[PDB]
From Swiss-Prot:
GO terms for cellular component: periplasmic space; plasma membrane. Changing C374N: Confers resistance to BTZ043 and PBTZ169. Decreases M.tuberculosis cytotoxicity in macrophages. Does not affect binding affinity of the substrate to the enzyme, but reduces catalytic efficiency by 4-fold. FAD binds at residues 47-57, 111, 116-119, 123-126, 178, 402. It comes from Mycobacterium tuberculosis (strain ATCC 25618 / H37Rv). PROSITE patterns: FAD_PCMH. This is Decaprenylphosphoryl-beta-D-ribose oxidase.
Length: 448
């Protein structure tokens, strides 16, 4: 069914009207692309997954949007080769659940499991294990791409079509529609983590902990940090680090089903704050609560600690998500940018801190080794012009923004942040001379 629909990214801003094709028939999808290609110039087409990108990369005002979520077959899982063969519309939660009984683990998980394989590839997503596992694109062994000429090209990371493979990774759907892919999974003997927790008192402590060599001992690592408090409390963090557990590390209670996968506003409607919360006893409690060694945790506990806070309303509309990475060596610059945020009069509570490891060969891939930050600002007067200033500082400090989080940076800024963009554009124009694939983001960021 083709239907005119008003679409936004997860941020609920920059809405646009598109014809949304929603069909489980792959032949039908090929036809829609064949059609647009024969128009000989229109507003093009773009794939859309579960719409978890905050910005405008999965919409196409006055053009076609192809919803890929019906194409959601897991074709095979093989424990011996560790390979999964899945439709692009398969989501990571579905995949995780299907693969666990084989002793296989999704090699890269984002902070939400409601993302499609196509969206994971097109945004080259990263997770808590980036420093040890790279991003999603690193684990794709092949994918089938529906190109503008209406052909399906079988792409591999090292084969004859390697250039197009690596332009599609992180390509935000602008090389064509990923129909199907083979992913190499991580072997695992349990669905649990062994975790170590640390709590730092300041930005300086947070940085030292990430720079002291301890990161090499954990496959998974991420932190919450304070973005509101004045120094020295600015940049103090709760750090969660771990690795997948082996069967013997589990307590007997859980050894029987090692691979099995199994809130607070309902218990405490008054809130969590008491008379002690912000004084010295509170500080002591938080420090001890966030400090531990060898704690066995399931996925929700280790990986989705946002889940227990239920209704606590800070992620829908009226918030601007901002994510950037600063190269590792630029520690002084990084610290400066954190100070700029604190003094801005814009207050973010939901803050992510993570040290990225080595980048991959995708020219538009977001992650580079360095200090990754997410912040979430309430929309209020002055914010648009302030984040523009942030863009300037991110750029001048060698860093970049993430397309999966952006709806408002300029083409000029984006291009300077991605010095391989011309290289990428040359590939896209080779594979899509007629701009059959197009999106609001493509036009805004001049990637069309
Ligand atoms: C709560 C939350 C937490 C998050 N945490 C993280 C995180 O930790 N790390 C991280 O990297 N990201 C994170 N994200 C961002 C998210 O992982 C990406 O935006 C991801 O691309 C969303 O997948 P999707 O299927 O919803 O794709 P959509 O947002 O629907 O589309 C995103 C892009 O993928 C393209 N696309 C989708 N399907 C296909 C296809 N079949 N072929 C070609 N192109 C396609 C679209 O054209 C678009 O350019 C988070 C998002 C949310 C809401
Ligand atoms: O909501 C999001 O967009 C989000 N983005 C993330 C980007 C990177 C990473 C990284 F890999 F680095 F750990 C994690 C991300 N997590 C996201 N959301 C889940 C989430 C956000 C904030 C918090 C915290 F504030 F710390 F409690 C806890 C969980
Ligand atoms: C951001 C990252 C989740 O991938 O870490 C959150 C952990 C440290 O929880 C922090 C608590 C206090 O909110």
């Amino acid at each position: 069914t083709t239907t005119a629909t008003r679409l936004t990214g997860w941020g609920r801003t920059a809405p646009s009207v598109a014809n949304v094709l929603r069909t489980p028939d792959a032949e039908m999808i090929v036809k829609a692309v064949a059609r647009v290609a024969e128009s000989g110039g229109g507003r093009g087409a773009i794939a859309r997954g579960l719409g978890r990108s905050y910005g405008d990369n999965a919409q196409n005002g006055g053009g076609l949007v192809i919803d890929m979520t019906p194409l959601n077959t897991i074709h095979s899982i093989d424990a011996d080769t560790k390979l999964v063969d899945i439709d692009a519309g398969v989501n990571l939660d579905q995949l995780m659940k299907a693969a666990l009984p084989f002793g296989l683990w999704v090699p890269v998980l984002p902070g939400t499991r409601q993302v499609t394989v196509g969206g994971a590839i097109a945004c080259d997503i990263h997770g808590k294990n980036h420093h040890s596992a790279g991003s999603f694109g690193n684990h794709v062994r092949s994918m089938d791409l529906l190109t503008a000429d209406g052909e399906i090209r079988h792409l591999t990371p090292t084969g004859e079509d390697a250039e197009l493979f690596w332009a599609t990774v992180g390509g935000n759907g602008l090389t064509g529609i990923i129909m199907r892919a083979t992913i190499e999974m991580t072997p695992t003997s349990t669905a649990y983590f062994i975790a170590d927790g640390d709590v730092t008192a300041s930005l300086d402590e947070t940085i030292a902990l990430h720079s002291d060599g301890s990161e090499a001992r954990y496959t998974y690592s991420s932190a919450w940090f304070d973005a509101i408090s004045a120094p020295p409390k600015l940049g103090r963090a709760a750090v969660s680090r771990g690795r997948l557990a082996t069967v013997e590390q589990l307590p007997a209670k859980l050894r029987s089903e090692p691979l099995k996968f199994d809130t607070l506003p309902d218990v405490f409607p008054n809130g969590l704050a008491n008379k002690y919360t912000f004084g010295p006893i509170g500080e002591l409690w938080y420090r001890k609560s966030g400090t531990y060694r060898g704690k066995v945790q399931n996925l929700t506990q280790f990986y989705h600690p946002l889940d227990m806070f239920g209704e606590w309303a800070y992620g829908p509309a009226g918030f601007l998500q901002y994510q950037f990475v600063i190269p590792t060596e630029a520690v002084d610059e990084f610290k400066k940018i954190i100070g700029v945020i604190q003094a801005s009069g814009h207050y973010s509570f939901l803050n992510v801190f993570k040290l990225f490891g080595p980048r991959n060969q995708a020219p538009l891939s977001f992650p580079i080794p360095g200090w990754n930050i997410c912040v979430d600002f309430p929309i209020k007067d002055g914010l648009g012009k302030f984040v523009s200033e942030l863009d300037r500082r991110v750029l001048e400090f060698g860093g970049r923004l993430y397309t999966a989080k952006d709806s408002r940076t300029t083409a000029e800024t984006f291009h300077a942040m991605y010095p391989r963009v011309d290289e990428w554009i040359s590939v896209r124009r080779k594979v899509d001379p007629l701009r059959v694939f197009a999106s609001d983001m493509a036009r805004r960021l001049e990637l069309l």
